[PDB]
Design a protein around this ligand. Structure first.
Ligand SMILES: [Cl-]
Ligand SMILES: [Cl-]
Ligand SMILES: [Cl-]
Ligand SMILES: [Cl-]
Ligand SMILES: [Cl-]
Ligand SMILES: [Zn+2]
Ligand SMILES: [Zn+2]
Lengths: 142, 142
């Protein structure tokens, strides 16, 4: 779980992942430190690209983490092929309101259409609009 | 996962678990079938306690399930004391809106103070009012 790229972002609240949104972050590296996930991202804030470091701390159960950011978050990791892609589902609690932000990471800037399609269908199968899924592999970003 | 009782309900949207709420259901039994969880609950409607049968389907993750109810739900099972209690977290997706409904089940109508307190503070630590936690152990319910 080293070198990564954010390929697709999906959220119950589109603004969370729109330009300069709190969850429009682009992963660069993920370091596992004592079961915790040390993430290094880049993000655009007021006209520039800036570094963002966040640690998702382990919990009583594997693949589930806790992260303090834009409130609190329950983080779940998933992947059939851990060396090809990584999926992180964030349930963000911001002042009493809950939102889900799904992240699809790839070893390179893009991922197979198969992986991306299933990721996107799963999101849509949960009642979310296609407009809320942002494939950033086809977009220039930080 | 036999005999169970709903002891505490907690939700990001209080109305979901108050009277007439879609998630104010009382577990009676949980039967495992092919990795799936077949739950039998009671629901209060028009003065009567009515049966509610729902199957939470397995996934590529042992304690994770999928459930079609009041929209769709990603369900997670947790418990450090499997024969004493069961915790089920429902991330509900209804009309593009996300809500979290946590259920604490006991072998009997009530549960250890230690278990209930940990459950309750974990929920509160995510920015929710104590108002959103309903301990029904002493409430006359189905
Ligand atoms: Cl690369
Ligand atoms: Cl690169
Ligand atoms: Cl009993
Ligand atoms: Cl009984
Ligand atoms: Cl009742
Ligand atoms: Zn690269
Ligand atoms: Zn009993």
């Amino acid at each position: 779980l080293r070198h990564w790229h954010t390929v697709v972002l999906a959220s119950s609240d589109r603004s969370l992942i729109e330009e300069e949104g709190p969850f429009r972050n682009f992963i660069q590296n993920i370091t596992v430190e004592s079961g915790n996930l040390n993430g290094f991202f880049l993000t655009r804030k007021n006209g520039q690209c800036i570094p963002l470091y966040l640690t998702a701390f382990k919990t009583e159960e594997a693949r589930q983490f806790k992260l303090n950011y834009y409130g609190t978050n329950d983080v779940y990791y998933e992947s059939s092929k851990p060396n090809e892609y990584a999926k992180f589902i964030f349930y963000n609690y911001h002042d009493g309101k809950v939102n889900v932000v799904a992240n699809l990471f790839g070893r390179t800037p893009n991922l197979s259409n198969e992986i991306k399609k299933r990721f996107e269908e799963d999101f849509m199968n949960r009642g979310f609009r296609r407009e809320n899924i942002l494939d950033i592999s086809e977009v220039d970003h930080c």
